[PDB]
Write an enzyme that holds these catalytic residues in place. Structure first.
Site, short mmCIF file in Angstrom:
data_model
loop_
_atom_site.label_atom_id
_atom_site.label_comp_id
_atom_site.label_asym_id
_atom_site.label_seq_id
_atom_site.Cartn_x
_atom_site.Cartn_y
_atom_site.Cartn_z
N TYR A 38 0.83 -1.20 0.00
CA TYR A 38 0.00 0.00 0.00
C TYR A 38 0.87 1.25 0.00
O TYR A 38 1.80 1.37 0.80
CB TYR A 38 -0.91 -0.01 1.22
CG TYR A 38 -2.06 0.96 1.20
CD1 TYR A 38 -1.92 2.27 1.68
CD2 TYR A 38 -3.32 0.56 0.73
CE1 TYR A 38 -2.98 3.16 1.67
CE2 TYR A 38 -4.39 1.44 0.72
CZ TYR A 38 -4.21 2.73 1.19
OH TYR A 38 -5.26 3.62 1.19
N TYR B 146 -8.76 3.42 -3.75
CA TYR B 146 -9.22 3.80 -5.09
C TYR B 146 -10.54 4.56 -5.08
O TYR B 146 -10.66 5.57 -5.78
CB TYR B 146 -9.35 2.60 -6.03
CG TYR B 146 -8.05 1.95 -6.48
CD1 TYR B 146 -6.93 2.71 -6.86
CD2 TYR B 146 -7.97 0.57 -6.57
CE1 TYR B 146 -5.76 2.09 -7.28
CE2 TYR B 146 -6.81 -0.06 -6.98
CZ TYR B 146 -5.72 0.70 -7.34
OH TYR B 146 -4.58 0.06 -7.75
N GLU C 294 0.19 -2.55 -7.98
CA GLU C 294 -0.58 -3.60 -8.65
C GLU C 294 0.28 -4.46 -9.55
O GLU C 294 0.07 -5.67 -9.63
CB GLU C 294 -1.78 -3.05 -9.43
CG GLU C 294 -2.80 -2.26 -8.63
CD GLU C 294 -3.60 -3.06 -7.60
OE1 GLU C 294 -3.31 -4.24 -7.33
OE2 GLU C 294 -4.53 -2.46 -7.03
N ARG D 116 2.02 -6.86 -7.29
CA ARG D 116 1.09 -7.90 -6.82
C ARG D 116 0.75 -8.93 -7.89
O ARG D 116 0.58 -10.11 -7.59
CB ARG D 116 -0.21 -7.27 -6.30
CG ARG D 116 -0.07 -6.42 -5.05
CD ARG D 116 -1.32 -5.60 -4.83
NE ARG D 116 -1.15 -4.64 -3.74
CZ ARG D 116 -1.66 -3.41 -3.71
NH1 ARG D 116 -2.39 -2.95 -4.73
NH2 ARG D 116 -1.44 -2.64 -2.66
N1 LIG Z 1 -2.82 4.30 -1.66
C1 LIG Z 1 -3.10 3.09 -2.10
N2 LIG Z 1 -4.38 2.72 -2.33
C2 LIG Z 1 -4.72 1.50 -2.77
N3 LIG Z 1 -6.02 1.21 -2.96
C3 LIG Z 1 -6.41 0.00 -3.43
C4 LIG Z 1 -7.78 -0.28 -3.55
O1 LIG Z 1 -8.61 0.59 -3.25
N4 LIG Z 1 -8.11 -1.57 -3.79
C5 LIG Z 1 -9.47 -2.18 -3.75
C6 LIG Z 1 -10.47 -1.68 -4.81
O2 LIG Z 1 -10.44 -0.49 -5.16
O3 LIG Z 1 -11.30 -2.53 -5.19
C7 LIG Z 1 -10.07 -2.11 -2.30
C8 LIG Z 1 -9.24 -2.30 -1.18
C9 LIG Z 1 -9.75 -2.24 0.12
C10 LIG Z 1 -11.11 -1.99 0.32
C11 LIG Z 1 -11.96 -1.81 -0.78
C12 LIG Z 1 -11.44 -1.87 -2.08
C13 LIG Z 1 -5.42 -0.97 -3.68
N5 LIG Z 1 -4.06 -0.66 -3.49
C14 LIG Z 1 -3.71 0.56 -3.03
C15 LIG Z 1 -2.37 0.90 -2.81
O4 LIG Z 1 -1.45 0.12 -3.03
N6 LIG Z 1 -2.07 2.18 -2.35
N1 LIG Z 2 -0.51 1.27 5.91
C1 LIG Z 2 -1.76 1.43 5.49
N2 LIG Z 2 -2.44 0.40 4.95
C2 LIG Z 2 -3.71 0.54 4.52
N3 LIG Z 2 -4.35 -0.52 3.99
C3 LIG Z 2 -5.63 -0.44 3.55
C4 LIG Z 2 -6.25 -1.57 3.00
O1 LIG Z 2 -7.37 -1.50 2.48
N4 LIG Z 2 -5.53 -2.70 3.11
C5 LIG Z 2 -5.93 -4.01 2.58
C6 LIG Z 2 -5.07 -5.11 3.22
O2 LIG Z 2 -4.01 -4.77 3.78
O3 LIG Z 2 -5.50 -6.28 3.14
C7 LIG Z 2 -5.76 -4.01 1.05
C8 LIG Z 2 -4.71 -3.29 0.45
C9 LIG Z 2 -4.56 -3.28 -0.94
C10 LIG Z 2 -5.48 -3.98 -1.73
C11 LIG Z 2 -6.53 -4.69 -1.14
C12 LIG Z 2 -6.67 -4.71 0.25
C13 LIG Z 2 -6.30 0.79 3.63
N5 LIG Z 2 -5.63 1.89 4.18
C14 LIG Z 2 -4.36 1.78 4.62
C15 LIG Z 2 -3.68 2.86 5.18
O4 LIG Z 2 -4.19 3.98 5.30
N6 LIG Z 2 -2.36 2.68 5.61
#
Ligand SMILES: Nc1nc2nc(C(=O)N[C@H](C(=O)O)c3ccccc3)cnc2c(=O)[nH]1
Ligand SMILES: Nc1nc2nc(C(=O)N[C@H](C(=O)O)c3ccccc3)cnc2c(=O)[nH]1
Length: 263
Positions: A76, A119, A173, A176
């Site tokens: 992330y 996202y 991504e 991953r």
């Molecule tokens: N800043 C940051 N944001 C990210 N956001 C996503 C990101 O939103 N991924 C998912 C999506 O949009 O379907 C999701 C993840 C957790 C809860 C709901 C949906 C996935 N990866 C990242 C990342 O690597 N960095």
């Molecule tokens: N360090 C950090 N991590 C975060 N992680 C998430 C968050 O949704 N994390 C999920 C997870 O760790 O399983 C996720 C991340 C990318 C794609 C899908 C799911 C969401 N927000 C944050 C954040 O604000 N800081």
């Protein structure tokens, strides 16, 4: 203290991008956890703070640099540094809020955005969905400049959000998913920018579920199928880890691995 991986969009090639993504993956995973040939990212539980982040230093043809900070547990993007200023997304919890205090400690100006970095939030601010945001070397070149100039007022909020969306997909991504890395390699090879197709979008949206399904599987077999999409938008059913081995490069930790059975 945290490891740094460098990439430049300036004269980027398939090979230089491939080297970059390989290096990012190498700093993300330890080799301690590999299940059905697929590496799992470190468990957040008991992970020491000195091992929590990696830094991705992005340079461009415009001679500008920004440094992204990635959480090793999930790749992330938690925030970035541009020169004398650092910017962090609104943390999702107290632990992640504490963790970011260990990043860019020598920087003059520290800011935390009032918005989170997922996202859905970023698309809202961009005024565009991922499906309409072009990816490629050109978009990344432009994204780096946009992140760099944010502190001086040159970058509008929708542009900043769009630029984050570009960076996250082309770095996190791609790390991953071998499939998404491949899609970016193709864009770079032909220097042609394009928005991600439904195969890319559905993989991104399903990373957590795919990780859990694999880790909870019975010898690789899913209890429930997962529906993905092909390039043309048609449905693709996933029943087993086997088909995902060429697709997913890294999983997020979801559960402990079960012991093998002696036969
Ligand atoms: N800043 C940051 N944001 C990210 N956001 C996503 C990101 O939103 N991924 C998912 C999506 O949009 O379907 C999701 C993840 C957790 C809860 C709901 C949906 C996935 N990866 C990242 C990342 O690597 N960095
Ligand atoms: N360090 C950090 N991590 C975060 N992680 C998430 C968050 O949704 N994390 C999920 C997870 O760790 O399983 C996720 C991340 C990318 C794609 C899908 C799911 C969401 N927000 C944050 C954040 O604000 N800081």
């Amino acid at each position: 203290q945290y490891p740094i991986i460098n990439f430049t969009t300036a004269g980027a090639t398939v090979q230089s991008y491939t080297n970059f993504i390989r290096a990012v993956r190498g700093r993300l995973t330890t080799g301690a956890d590999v299940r059905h040939e697929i590496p799992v990212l470190p468990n957040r539980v008991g992970l020491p703070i000195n091992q929590r982040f990696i830094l991705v230093e992005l340079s461009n043809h415009a001679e500008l640099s920004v440094t992204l900070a990635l959480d090793v547990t999930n790749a992330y993007v938690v925030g970035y540094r541009a020169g004398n200023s650092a910017y962090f997304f609104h943390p999702d919890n107290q632990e992640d809020a504490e963790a970011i205090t260990h990043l860019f400690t020598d920087v003059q100006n520290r800011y935390t955005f009032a918005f989170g970095g997922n996202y859905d939030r970023l698309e809202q601010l961009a005024g565009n969905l991922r499906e309409n945001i072009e990816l490629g070397n050109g978009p990344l070149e432009e994204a780096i400049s946009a992140l760099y100039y944010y502190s001086t007022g040159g970058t509008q909020l929708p542009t900043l959000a769009r630029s984050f969306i570009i960076c996250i997909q082309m770095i996190s991504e791609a790390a991953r998913f071998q499939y998404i890395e491949g899609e970016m390699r193709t864009r770079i090879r032909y220097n042609r920018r394009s928005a991600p197709d439904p195969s890319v979008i559905t993989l991104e949206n399903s990373w957590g579920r795919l990780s859990t399904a694999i880790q909870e599987s019975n010898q690789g077999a899913f209890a429930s199928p997962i529906q993905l999409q092909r390039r043309n938008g048609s449905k693709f059913s996933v029943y087993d880890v086997s088909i995902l081995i060429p697709i997913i490069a890294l999983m997020v930790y979801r559960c402990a691995p079960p012991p093998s059975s002696q036969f």
